[PDB]
């Protein structure tokens with residue numbers, strides 16, 4: 001049903017490069033306070049630059065640590081959200097950063113890799129672009145690998161409301177690649193909703209045959225607090241309900257620490273980047 | 278908004294007993310393979326029997342361990358699902374057990390306490406019945422206390438679709454009490470959907486003023502596997518969407534262990550026990 005590559009792809013980098021056929025490739029690393037891991041991520045990919053990869057940027061999303069200086073010292077082009085699109089005031093969240101990154105790149109193909117990876121494989125990018133390069137009509141490639149939000153919230157909600165996407169193992173995965181034509185044609189959900197939004201919109205518009213998923217081997221759970229997962233789940237839900245035509249209250253999740261706190265949720269997507277042309 | 282008792286209730290057992298005023302109290306312990314903890318739970322409550330508590334049963338939900346013999350050796354009346362209602366074939370899941378327990382009790386008030394508690398407080402039952410006994414119009418009392426499904430799935434979904442219930446700290450809590458009149462008037466969701474179903478139905482029919490929540494002090498996370506949480510979340514979602522008028526696919530969550538497995542979900546509620554009269 002869904003083109004799934006279960007084992008190590010066999011394509012060599014030179015085959016893949018040859019297969020580009022004039023198409024270009026941009027790589028985007030969104031980054032918010034990832035000073036510990038950003039350089040390792042950049043280094044895993046920079047040997048591809050001027051070859052398979054035509055372009056690499058770090059999309060810095062307001063870091064106040066050493067993310068930017070360290071990315072620069074690893075030879076990466078670093079682009080702030082403001083620089084990506086300076087006529088338009090910056091909103092918080094991941095989705096804003098990824099959407100803005102479209103204005104700061106020009107590749108026919110765009111690859112996203114999270115900047116929080118601990119020793120990422122140097123073949124992530126080649127493995128992700130394979131189906132886009134080699135085939136016809138694949139426009140989106142998702143990764144999978146051996147989380148709580150994914151397995152308790154997103155996958156069960158998909159089974160409930162878009163069971164056709166039940167075969168996708170990591171719908172929330174931060175590692176994926178897509179054609180510019182697709183990406184600039186889709187709205188971008190705010191915050192942590194962006195991946196699930198892109199997947200449902202992609203499916204609704206082109207169906208499964210435009211989607212592939214590739215095995216990246218092994219990944220281990222980021223350690224983050226429960227409360228951040230709470231807010232994340234809320235935004236994933238808001239984005240998922242909206243794509244399925246269901247009205248969301250717009251009310252943020254409240255949590256009680258013995259004290260009460262309400263986290264922000266957003267029901268506002270960014271429009272297709274195409275309108276900004 | 279929602280009557281919440283944040284500290285230790287001050288009512289003494291003799292006040293509470295006096296406040297019954299001819300009303301009776303049943304206690305139900307649903308149990309599936311809880312041989313390690315069932316006796317401690319029964320013992321925490323049996324000193325109340327023939328006083329505040331008029332009736333205690335263990336609703337045995339198909340145990341194949343020593344649950345039943347150990348409950349009997351602690352002086353509990355043990356009722357199988359079949360015995361609770363023998364003309365009607367037994368379905369799997371928690372909701373079936375709780376629903377059936379209504380036919381095996383006759384208290385004006387029914388208290389549910391999970392049978393998997395590690396050293397439960399002997400005041401759980403007095404604390405839960407307090408608002409039902411002392412006041413007017415409270416028909417349902419939920420507990421709260423210092424889980425993943427609760428905080429990632431149920432609370433965020435309530436915020437999305439029934440934000441009025443956002444102030445409920447433990448919507449999925451297995452410890453609660455209610456009037457028979459209320460309980461026999463509501464359908465019972467299958468599986469792990471039963472608590473969330475009772476809460477939403479209660480709210481929709483009587484509003485918040487009929488609902489209270491009481492502090493039980495401290496509770497610690499049951500250790501159960503992620504996959505069981507996956508199936509649990511799916512059923513909670515199915516029950517929640519249905520109460521909110523949203524169609525659920527009826528498709529079970531699938532998980533990939535490198536091998537694939539699909540877990541059951543049910544879109545079938547039991548009707549109000551009243552129709553069985």
Ligand SMILES: O=c1ccn([C@@H]2O[C@H](COP(=O)(O)OP(=O)(O)O)[C@@H](O)[C@H]2O)c(=O)[nH]1
Nearest residue numbers: 030031032034061093094097114115116222
């Ligand atoms: O407003 C944001 C939030 C996240 N990210 C980036 O998106 C990626 C995934 O975010 P996540 O919160 O999952 O990673 P974490 O913060 O736990 O390291 C990270 O590399 C972040 O640096 C970002 O650029 N802007």
Ligand SMILES: O=c1ccn([C@@H]2O[C@H](COP(=O)(O)OP(=O)(O)O)[C@@H](O)[C@H]2O)c(=O)[nH]1
Nearest residue numbers: 307308309311338370371374391392393499
């Ligand atoms: O089909 C079921 C499932 C659960 N329970 C009871 O409902 C309570 C809560 O179930 P849960 O799965 O949360 O507890 P666990 O199995 O982890 O001990 C337990 O005491 C169970 O014995 C039951 O009677 N029948």
